[PDB]
């Protein structure tokens, strides 16, 4: 048995918003039994914690005071020190430890980046805040739901398609060093989604607009000389706002920890789409 709850829900929503604004950045000390003298020698990490599986848990910062002279100087090292030594219930993805897998992408103190190859402010006064990627649903602690990112990646058909049979089948698709260097700086993406989680167009329209990373992959498969579905890929990415929604903010190239330039790739894709639209009229006549 249930009844209409528009009024109760509305009042609760407004009141909760006001209170949260009053009590934003809620913080709970991991170990309150710390003399303020000791905290002079220890740096403070504010780690976002949230366990939606537990019905009684709510998001909150947890404060950990750690001696930075016990582990190497990287965000992942500090996170794992906290997990192993202080609280082993902390959750985070980590495979490669050398910035290759791209699993550890998190909001390392105000900037999306891989936690394994990013240092942290050594100063003991300013606190460090570690939170998950911004606009991604949070599963537990620093683990977000990147499923939609992969689903979008699947829609670009990232596999070499060729319309012309190989002449002899005992050779390799010819490609000069120039047609290979055309891909240099473009195939190194590790699909970390750090850039795409920083693109405002991706904030507003996660589904209709592919991220900067996926569009960069489409560009990689387009510029590749061995594939023959150039126009087909261009047309496929030209639908609705799969690409048109990009506003050339340029944050994608700024955040990329690998040093890639997805902004330039998207710009080239836009130019190619414009030329495709024009010459669909100019050529066929």
């Amino acid at each position: 048995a249930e009844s209409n709850d528009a009024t109760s829900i509305c009042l609760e929503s407004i009141s909760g918003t006001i209170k949260g604004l009053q009590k934003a950045n809620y913080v709970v000390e991991h170990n309150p039994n710390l003399t303020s003298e000791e905290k002079k020698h220890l740096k403070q990490f504010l780690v976002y914690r949230y366990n939606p599986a537990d019905p009684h848990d709510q998001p909150k910062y947890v404060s950990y005071w750690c001696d930075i002279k016990k582990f190497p100087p990287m965000f992942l090292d500090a996170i794992l020190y906290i997990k192993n030594e202080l609280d082993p219930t902390l959750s985070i993805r980590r495979s490669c430890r050398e910035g290759i897998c791209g699993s550890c992408a998190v909001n390392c103190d105000g900037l999306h980046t891989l936690a394994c190859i990013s240092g942290f402010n050594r100063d003991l006064s300013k606190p460090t805040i570690i939170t998950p990627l911004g606009h991604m649903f949070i599963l537990k602690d620093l683990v977000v739901d990147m499923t939609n990112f992969y689903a979008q990646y699947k829609m670009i058909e990232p596999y070499l398609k060729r319309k012309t049979p190989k002449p002899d089948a005992n050779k390799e698709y010819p490609q000069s060093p120039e047609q290979r260097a055309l891909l240099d700086g473009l195939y190194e993406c590790v699909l970390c989604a750090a850039c795409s989680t920083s693109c405002p167009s991706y904030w507003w329209h996660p589904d209709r607009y592919l991220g900067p990373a996926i569009l960069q992959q489409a560009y990689r498969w387009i510029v590749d000389s061995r594939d023959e579905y150039t126009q087909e890929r261009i047309e496929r990415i030209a639908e609705d706002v799969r690409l048109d929604d990009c506003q050339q903010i340029g944050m994608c190239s700024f955040t990329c920890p690998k040093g890639l330039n997805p902004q330039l790739s998207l710009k080239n894709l836009m130019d190619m789409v414009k030329d495709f639209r024009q010459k669909r009229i100019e050529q066929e006549v």
């Binding site: 998001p59 900037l111 911004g134 903010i249």
Partner: protein, 59 residues
């Protein structure tokens, strides 16, 4: 089913020069168009007003 939630990125990203540079242009254009439309609406509104009446007048 407890709906999932997320932390809006713009609430937790250090302010950057790219955001500023691009949103500056967007806000310039937004301001231009809003100013034009609001001026039109203001002229319409003020012209819609009634004429001053006498003191303590009914009808």
């Amino acid at each position: 089913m407890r709906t999932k939630l997320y932390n809006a990125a713009y609430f937790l990203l250090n302010n950057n020069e790219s955001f500023g540079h691009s949103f500056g242009i967007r806000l310039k254009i937004v301001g231009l168009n809003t100013w034009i439309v609001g001026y039109a609406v203001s002229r319409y509104y003020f012209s819609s007003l009634r004429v001053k009446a006498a003191q303590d007048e009914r009808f």
